[PDB]
Design an enzyme around this catalytic site. Structure first.
Site, short mmCIF file in Angstrom:
data_model
loop_
_atom_site.label_atom_id
_atom_site.label_comp_id
_atom_site.label_asym_id
_atom_site.label_seq_id
_atom_site.Cartn_x
_atom_site.Cartn_y
_atom_site.Cartn_z
N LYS A 70 -2.65 -5.57 9.56
CA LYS A 70 -1.31 -5.69 9.25
C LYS A 70 -0.96 -4.31 8.53
CE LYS A 70 -1.62 -7.80 4.62
NZ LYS A 70 -1.07 -9.12 4.02
N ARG B 1 4.43 -1.09 -2.56
CA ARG B 1 4.73 0.04 -2.52
C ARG B 1 4.15 0.87 -1.32
NH1 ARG B 1 7.80 -1.23 -6.02
NH2 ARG B 1 8.12 -0.09 -7.98
#
Lengths: 357, 357
Positions: free
Chosen positions: A211, A275
């Site tokens: 992912k 982030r």
């Protein structure tokens, strides 16, 4: 004892957590709750933590809070911290591995030198992989081979703080052992942390690992100012190449696992949070002017980007089998990330007159 | 002529577009390009538009731009607008239906009263459905039954302007007729508009229709200020209930179609764009203080929300078969939208001690 029910005859199952970190701490809240509330589990949950600092073991035992990694969230008092593996693993029926794969080999090695019960069941909660001879080994498999116990896998659309703050989350437990799954589900299921089970670990763990490549690609799209049409296309292709990578290199990939929390949901949670997309986005804007290492410090507060690493080893396995043609996205993403390829190549990979059959 | 190759013997295939609107205009750019560039297709693409206004037909024919719906984008000059169906449908080999289902019945009825060629092939490009006796009928099927020609379906992660502005987009063409698919792919495929084919229309069209319920749910999450963990969970459940709705009520649903552009990609494009999630978000914040009709004017510039409508008929079909237990999300979404249920019920539906097998 030859199984969990043999052990349940004599008394409740002893749960032990390995790892210190925001997710490990958040999970101790979940596990500690069920350990107390459930008659099958012994109330005390022993937790092995790294010897960090005012010393971390004492903070948890006395202040009942992980003031470093999960600041502000009160942990259940039935969690008991220990600095040494032996005081946690011995007589443990259920072993929850929440150790970053940057440390997993050392920990497993230290255990092998402390007695693991033969009937003991394990579960891996860390998203990632272990490298063995430039090949990608999935954590549950590696734990299960290094030690000699069955190892299930837990992954989901989970952000440590959302779970810790009792916001509705789900998770997927994968496991080849059916008698383990029924119990693991009870260890983890709470109203704010709903658990589905599946009979295989491969797909669950590939999702959690790969992912990050898809998140990296999303960042690249954000950085290039691409419209949603285009970003969604890139994501789709990343998902399909993730599936293919599983099929080719791990012999199988059930696509239905994308319908589980560890699949599609965790992918969209991963690029819409953290982030890590921002980091890849800022990389592609700087082009070659900044290295990944510089942006890791600058953006992720010193933390290493999981996506870049995963891509390096994923691509390597693709390259050695000479299948770069069948993984166009992963290939160009590698080129752009490590081989100074122009970011414009991302869209050029797909914007062509090649007609699909 | 008994097939497209019979007709190709005598000369190039004549393409005709039905519909006026931003997506129809954007598609005329795509179709007009390929019609010119491809030797198989006749260069002139006739387009039937509604008689709107300075009159719309003349604007397109003279100024070569849809100044109302696709302002600023030059259309190919080989597009030719007509106000009457007959001048577009007669001698047409390929019929592209881009008519909103709010008007589809009237248009099809008017055609039935103008001769459609027996060898002619059709394709539906409008996301939605038609209601017949409180039952949901998919467009390609309805077109194919009302007229007597095969009808394929096109849906993708497409936003009219992104495609019109030549940004990388993809689309999925579904079709039960294999000889149609090879041609439809050529009508539409461009470097900025990549086409994959699948052998069934059901899944492609259910996605385009029911994605709006998932977008509505996303709005509800945004409005309730829910974390991504929770929104991703809701989305996942919406996708699975979409799949189940297809399986139950349309006899089948291939989950792999979620890996296509019309599936997962179009779902994430749909909630990350438009004003339709924002509309559902603002509804749930107002609770009962504002009706949908008020928010449609206030937010969507007078336009009707596709999501609320789709939910009403989807739920109705679920309710009459007494399966509301198997569609918890769609059920509570209906309750909240139309039966004044407290928005808090959304999370309460899933935050429970029910343990999945």
């Amino acid at each position: 004892y030859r199984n969990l029910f043999d052990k349940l005859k004599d008394g409740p199952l002893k749960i032990s957590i390995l790892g210190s970190g925001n997710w490990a701490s958040a999970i101790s809240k979940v596990v500690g709750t069920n350990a107390k509330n459930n008659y099958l589990f012994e109330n005390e949950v022993r937790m092995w933590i790294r010897d960090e600092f005012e010393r971390m073991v004492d903070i948890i035992n006395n202040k009942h809070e992980n003031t470093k990694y999960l600041k502000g969230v009160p942990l259940p008092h039935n969690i008991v911290a220990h600095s040494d593996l032996a005081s946690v693993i011995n007589d443990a029926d259920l072993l929850i591995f929440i150790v970053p794969c940057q440390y997993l080999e050392s920990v497993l090695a230290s255990i092998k030198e402390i007695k693991i019960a033969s009937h003991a069941k394990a579960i891996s909660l860390t998203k990632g992989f272990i490298v063995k001879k430039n090949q990608m080994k999935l954590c549950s498999n590696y734990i299960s081979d290094f030690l000699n116990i069955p190892c299930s896998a837990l992954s989901g659309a989970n952000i440590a703080m959302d779970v810790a703050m009792e916001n509705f989350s789900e998770a997927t437990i994968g496991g080849n052992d059916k008698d383990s799954l029924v119990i693991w589900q009870r260890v983890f299921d709470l109203p704010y942390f709903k658990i589905n089970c599946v009979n295989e670990t491969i797909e669950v763990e590939i999702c959690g690992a790969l992912k990050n490549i898809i998140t990296l690609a999303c960042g690249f799209c954000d950085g290039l100012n691409l419209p949603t049409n285009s970003k969604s296309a890139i994501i789709r292709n990343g998902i399909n190449e993730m599936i293919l990578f599983g099929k080719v290199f791990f012999q199988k990939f059930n696509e239905n696992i994308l319908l589980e929390s560890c699949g599609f949901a965790d992918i969209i949670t991963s690029f819409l949070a953290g982030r890590n997309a921002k980091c890849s986005a800022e990389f592609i804007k700087s082009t070659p002017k900044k290295t990944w290492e510089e942006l890791e410090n600058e953006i992720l507060k010193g933390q290493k980007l999981q996506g870049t690493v995963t891509l390096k080893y994923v691509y390597h396995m693709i390259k050695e089998k000479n299948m770069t043609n069948e993984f166009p996205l992963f290939t160009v993403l590698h080129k752009i990330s490590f081989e100074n390829e122009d970011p414009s190549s991302l869209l050029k990979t797909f914007m062509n007159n090649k007609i699909n059959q």
